[PDB]
Amino acid sequence: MDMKRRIHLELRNRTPAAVRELVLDNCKSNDGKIEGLTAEFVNLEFLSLINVGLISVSNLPKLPKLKKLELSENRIFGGLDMLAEKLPNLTHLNLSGNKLKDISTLEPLKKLECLKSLDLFNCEVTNLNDYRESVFKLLPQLTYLDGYDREDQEAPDSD
Amino acid sequence: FNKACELTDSSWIELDEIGEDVAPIEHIASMRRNYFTAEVSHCRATEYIMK
Amino acid sequence: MDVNPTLLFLKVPVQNAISTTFPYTGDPPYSHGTGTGYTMDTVNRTHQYSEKGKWTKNTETGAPQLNPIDGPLPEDNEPSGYAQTDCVLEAMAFLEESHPGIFENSCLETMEIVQQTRVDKLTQGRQTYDWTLNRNQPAATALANTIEIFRSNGLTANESGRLIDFLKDVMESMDKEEMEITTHKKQRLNKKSYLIRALTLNTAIATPGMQIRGFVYFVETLARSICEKLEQSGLPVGGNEKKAKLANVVRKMMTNSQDTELSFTITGDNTKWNENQNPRMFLAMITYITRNQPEWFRNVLSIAPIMFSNKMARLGRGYMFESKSMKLRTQIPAEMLANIDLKYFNELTKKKIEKIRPLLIDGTASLSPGMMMGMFNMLSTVLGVSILNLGQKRYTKTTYWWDGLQSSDDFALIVNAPNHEGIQAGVDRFYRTCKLVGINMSKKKSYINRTGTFEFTSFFYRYGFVANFSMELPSFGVSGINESADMSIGVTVIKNNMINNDLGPATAQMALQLFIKDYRYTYRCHRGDTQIQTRRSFELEKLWEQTRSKAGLLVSDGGPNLYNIRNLHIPEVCLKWELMDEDYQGRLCNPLNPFVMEYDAVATTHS
Amino acid sequence: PFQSLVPKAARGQYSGFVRTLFQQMRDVLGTFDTVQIIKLLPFAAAPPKQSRMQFSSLTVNVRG
Numbered sequence A: 001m002d003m004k005r006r007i008h009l010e011l012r013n014r015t016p017a018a019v020r021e022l023v024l025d026n027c028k029s030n031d032g033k034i035e036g037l038t039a040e041f042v043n044l045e046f047l048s049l050i051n052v053g054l055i056s057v058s059n060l061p062k063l064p065k066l067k068k069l070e071l072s073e074n075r076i077f078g079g080l081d082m083l084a085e086k087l088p089n090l091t092h093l094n095l096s097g098n099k100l101k102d103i104s105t106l107e108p109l110k111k112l113e114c115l116k117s118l119d120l121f122n123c124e125v126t127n128l129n130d131y132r133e134s135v136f137k138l139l140p141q142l143t144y145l146d147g148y149d150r151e152d153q154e155a156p157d158s159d
Numbered sequence B: 001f002n003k004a005c006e007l008t009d010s011s012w013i014e015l016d017e018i019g020e021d022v023a024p025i026e027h028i029a030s031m032r033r034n035y036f037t038a039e040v041s042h043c044r045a046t047e048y049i050m051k
Numbered sequence C: 001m002d003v004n005p006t007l008l009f010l011k012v013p014v015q016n017a018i019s020t021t022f023p024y025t026g027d028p029p030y031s032h033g034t035g036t037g038y039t040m041d042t043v044n045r046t047h048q049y050s051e052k053g054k055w056t057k058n059t060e061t062g063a064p065q066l067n068p069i070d071g072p073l074p075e076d077n078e079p080s081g082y083a084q085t086d087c088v089l090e091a092m093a094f095l096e097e098s099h100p101g102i103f104e105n106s107c108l109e110t111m112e113i114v115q116q117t118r119v120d121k122l123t124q125g126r127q128t129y130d131w132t133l134n135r136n137q138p139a140a141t142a143l144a145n146t147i148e149i150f151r152s153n154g155l156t157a158n159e160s161g162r163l164i165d166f167l168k169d170v171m172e173s174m175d176k177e178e179m180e181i182t183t184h185k186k187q188r189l190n191k192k193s194y195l196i197r198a199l200t201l202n203t204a205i206a207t208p209g210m211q212i213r214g215f216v217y218f219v220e221t222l223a224r225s226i227c228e229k230l231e232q233s234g235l236p237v238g239g240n241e242k243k244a245k246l247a248n249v250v251r252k253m254m255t256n257s258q259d260t261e262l263s264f265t266i267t268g269d270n271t272k273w274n275e276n277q278n279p280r281m282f283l284a285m286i287t288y289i290t291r292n293q294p295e296w297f298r299n300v301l302s303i304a305p306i307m308f309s310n311k312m313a314r315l316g317r318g319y320m321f322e323s324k325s326m327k328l329r330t331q332i333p334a335e336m337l338a339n340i341d342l343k344y345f346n347e348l349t350k351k352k353i354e355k356i357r358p359l360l361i362d363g364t365a366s367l368s369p370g371m372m373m374g375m376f377n378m379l380s381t382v383l384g385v386s387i388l389n390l391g392q393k394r395y396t397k398t399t400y401w402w403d404g405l406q407s408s409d410d411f412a413l414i415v416n417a418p419n420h421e422g423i424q425a426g427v428d429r430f431y432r433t434c435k436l437v438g439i440n441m442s443k444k445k446s447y448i449n450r451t452g453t454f455e456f457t458s459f460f461y462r463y464g465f466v467a468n469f470s471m472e473l474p475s476f477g478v479s480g481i482n483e484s485a486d487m488s489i490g491v492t493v494i495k496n497n498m499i500n501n502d503l504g505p506a507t508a509q510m511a512l513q514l515f516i517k518d519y520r521y522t523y524r525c526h527r528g529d530t531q532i533q534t535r536r537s538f539e540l541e542k543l544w545e546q547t548r549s550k551a552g553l554l555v556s557d558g559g560p561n562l563y564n565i566r567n568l569h570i571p572e573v574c575l576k577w578e579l580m581d582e583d584y585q586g587r588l589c590n591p592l593n594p595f596v597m598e599y600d601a602v603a604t605t606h607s
Numbered sequence D: 001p002f003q004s005l006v007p008k009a010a011r012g013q014y015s016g017f018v019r020t021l022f023q024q025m026r027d028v029l030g031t032f033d034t035v036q037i038i039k040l041l042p043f044a045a046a047p048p049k050q051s052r053m054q055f056s057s058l059t060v061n062v063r064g
Helices: A003-011 A081-086 A103-111 A131-138 B024-041 B044-050 C005-010 C036-048 C085-098 C102-114 C119-123 C139-152 C163-175 C191-198 C210-227 C240-252 C279-289 C295-301 C303-309 C334-338 C347-359 C377-389 C420-433 C483-500 C505-522 C537-545 C582-588 D011-027 D034-044
Strands: A046-048 A068-070 C054-057 C064-067 C128-130 C135-137 C178-182 C186-190 C200-202 C264-268 C312-314 C318-323 C328-333 C364-366 C403-406 C411-414 C447-450 C453-456 C459-462 C465-468
Touching: A081 A103, A103 A131, B024 B044, B024 C505, C036 C312, C036 C318, C036 C347, C085 C102, C085 C279, C085 C377, C102 C210, C102 C279, C102 C295, C119 C139, C119 C163, C119 C210, C128 C139, C128 C200, C128 C210, C135 C139, C139 C163, C139 C178, C139 C210, C163 C191, C163 C210, C178 C191, C186 C191, C191 C200, C210 C279, C210 C295, C210 C303, C210 C377, C240 C403, C240 C411, C240 C459, C240 C465, C264 C420, C264 C453, C279 C295, C279 C303, C279 C377, C295 C303, C318 C334, C328 C334, C334 C347, C347 C364, C377 C403, C377 C411, C411 C453, C447 C453, C483 C505, D011 D034
Parallel strands: A046 A068, C200 C312
Antiparallel strands: C054 C064, C128 C135, C178 C186, C264 C411, C264 C447, C312 C364, C318 C328, C403 C411, C453 C459, C459 C465
């Protein structure tokens, strides 16, 4: 079941304007891009693209209200500049298990105003020295990187 | 090596005391040693040492 | 970031952060080079470097012997042991001329030393080969066994106690027609077998037997007495004093080296030092040092080279064969290398065995051509200094003149000249004059750079600053004798280590901290305040409660440490004297105990 | 002078902590212990920094 199918399977005869949390993981990508979602999704605030073979997020929809996006287990190697404009209100991003290999790749996220968490587990960029410090200086608004704030104090629950 | 050169949230080496520092050379030695021990007490290299 | 510690050298000169490049401070947990392979290879190499010599057969031992002295002059920039007797004698004559009376005074001092030294001085050493067991045992055991066997065979002059009498007994033993060795086993060795057993080295990768050591000691005593008078030599000294010599030499060659005279320093290293020095040449130079001297002195001093030049070598433990299709692990002793079929071994080992087989006698391998490491270390330095003395500008009769430092296979040569061609010619005269005496400079371990920076036996000199990294950090742990002795030893270690092997104040203090930690953790004597709960805590707690002057308690009585740099030479019980409670003083140092440089300390209840 | 002994790395995080505690003695009427004030007062003389840690022991360096 590719995205276009499961989306409708998850649409559940409920109009796109009335979805607030959509879960689409392990499904597929057309070739390496999200296909099936459309801008009519306006009430969505939790999209989970986990394990969907995804080579980029170029053709992502426009979700004003998105706040909890997660692209873990995919193979994004850049092109995150789109997420800034297309998800102005995103405040919880989960890029774990992807193919990011440089701090430069995370430069585009600097212009997201309301960012609160960035999970970056199992990514080749996490093997660097002064990794967390460099990330926290490139993304000053961040207050939880990988789960801990600044002194390795776990992020409080109920987020 | 990159991860072995990083700080941690712990204090792995707990050294003991030394006599008072009277001689100026003693003061310089104590200053160097204290700065170093502060910079290396919390570290993953010390974790490997103690483990 | 990707951390690259070497990149630190982009900011700090290398000689400043040179310590970074030394991996270990301690003996590594691995064995680098040893065994039958690395001994057979050394034998083959020593014979290869002298292959154009004269082959003879030793009448007594009955083993082939290679004599390269006065052999063909070298023709390529490769090691050669063909030392020329005329060249060595001329070099030593010039050394005597430039330092009048040096040989005479050294000979007189050594002669005085010979007639006094006791046999006990022969047990203050390291492992030694027992000709009575074909094994290695500490010096005292070897000496005792040799003396017992000598007495059992009728030789008893060693009872006098003088070392020279023991040497006379050794020489007499070498003449006996049969030696009877009875071990705590009854065995008899004919003249040839015992002679081989006394002319053998076991596996510094080789240790001489007990017969050789007696004469080696006197020869090296003469060598030390000679070296102490040569400013060029740097072997007999150590620590801060050595750091002087470096500066001194750089001062000598730069006094007025400013009138365009280009100065250049060669940081060098002699390739295969031990495998080119020829004991025949050491005899040729000892016969020159001991001229116009009592015949007995010359005879006693000429017997170490004589015994080396006929020396044999035991290959080693042997090889280990592993069959991975049968899961078998067998061992082949070295004695069977003379007949075992040459199919098991690999190609390189097969070639080694084939090349060494002609030299195998009675399981050993004749090693006449060259010396072995660790022996005649201070007599080799004299030859090197003599070579360094041939650049005095009265012996070159030219415009380039060299003079430097050498420490037995480590040297730094300063080659002042008026222009670059002068430097390139004064380096060639040294590299060629130094090949005639069998010394081979290593071209792949040296380098020449303008004066003001070099390296000499790990004493890195840079523009007047000398960094001393020759010696390693000593073990900063409890000795393990008792509570009182360990504190006295451990503190003294740090003190005399700071004095001799340059140790920083801060690192000294941290070493003291680590020592105190180990001390308190071995003998459970943690501080009274500290909450560690051991079996000895309760008693230490109560004693803490009832002492008003808690500062006076010994570190072993759950008290506070008081040792800083300024008071590392003061014993504990005398440092913490005024601070003790009179009753505590009486209790600790009561002569009614039921309990009671090294360990210099006061006696207390802890012993 | 007391601030010289306290570790630099955690010199500030203590202050905040201690400061917060003292505020909770001025807001919760009826709670006031002199011993706690005289114990933790010198630890609160550095630029405070905020953290979510619950300190069990404030460390001070004497003679190494």
